[PDB]
Amino acid sequence: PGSARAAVSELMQLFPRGLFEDALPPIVLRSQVYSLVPDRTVADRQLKELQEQGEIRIVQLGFDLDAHGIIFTEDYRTRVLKASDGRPYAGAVQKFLASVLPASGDLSFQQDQMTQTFGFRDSEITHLVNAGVLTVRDAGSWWLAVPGAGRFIKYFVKGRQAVLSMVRKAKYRELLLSELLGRRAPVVVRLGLTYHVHDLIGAQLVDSISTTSGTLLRLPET
């Protein structure tokens, strides 16, 4: 009833665009959606509906317990076109965005489909790899990829570890949500405390316990 769409918009607002100088489309992770939409089946169904209505792209990122990213297709398009301006791979990127991206919601593309169905030459596929738009998936396919995602991946994993440590260091390896969110962020946490808390909850790296003091984040040792 708009649940996943509302969750995506709440999480998108947390993304610090300026951290990457606006070079990356804002990214939210599937497990963050589960923090706000705890019925995973409802969340997945509504995300699939958004994918089939053409509004979001699902991207393989590969974090333990939070494998997929979610991006608005128009944010991906406008900025990939922007990251490609005046570069050698601009033509190949434009062809990919105009013809391949609209043709499905898939996370990956087969080599034979790219060459035979869409008419890409090997050199043009190499341009897409150099642009950061494709990465190798297996011997016959490529993942859709986000130019500049490597920096996001490194900041994200370090921040996940640091926020989890804030919980681990607390008494009995548990910390109230209001307490955590009011702490100074460890310097390595670049994407923000709240952004990270939603990943920890949705991935089940912390349990979200309802108490008469509000939400308690508990490391799930048992």
Numbering used by the authors: 33 to 254
Question: What does the article say, verbatim?
Answer:
We determined the 1.32 Å crystal structure of human STK19, containing residues 31-254. The structure of STK19 reveals a compact fold consisting of three winged helix (WH) domains (WH1-WH3) packed together. Notably, the WH3 nucleic acid recognition helix (WH3-H3) is less accessible compared to WH1-H3 and WH2-H3, owing to its proximity to WH1-H2. The STK19 protein in solution is monomeric, as suggested by analytical gel filtration, run in parallel with dimeric Glutathione S-transferase (GST) protein of similar size and with gel filtration standards. This conclusion is also supported by chemical crosslinking using Disuccinimidyl Suberate (DSS). Electrostatic surface analysis of the STK19 structure reveals a large patch of basic residues centered on the WH3-H1 helix. These residues include R183, K186, K190, R192, R200, and K201 of the helix WH3-H1, K203 and R205 in the following loop, and R215, R216, and R222 in the H2-H3 loop of the WH3 domain. Mutations of these conserved residues, namely K186E, R200E/K201E/K203E, and R215E/R216E, abolished dsDNA binding. We selected and purified to homogeneity four STK19 protein variants harboring the patient mutation. Of the investigated mutations, K186N, R200W, and R215W significantly compromised STK19 dsDNA binding ability.
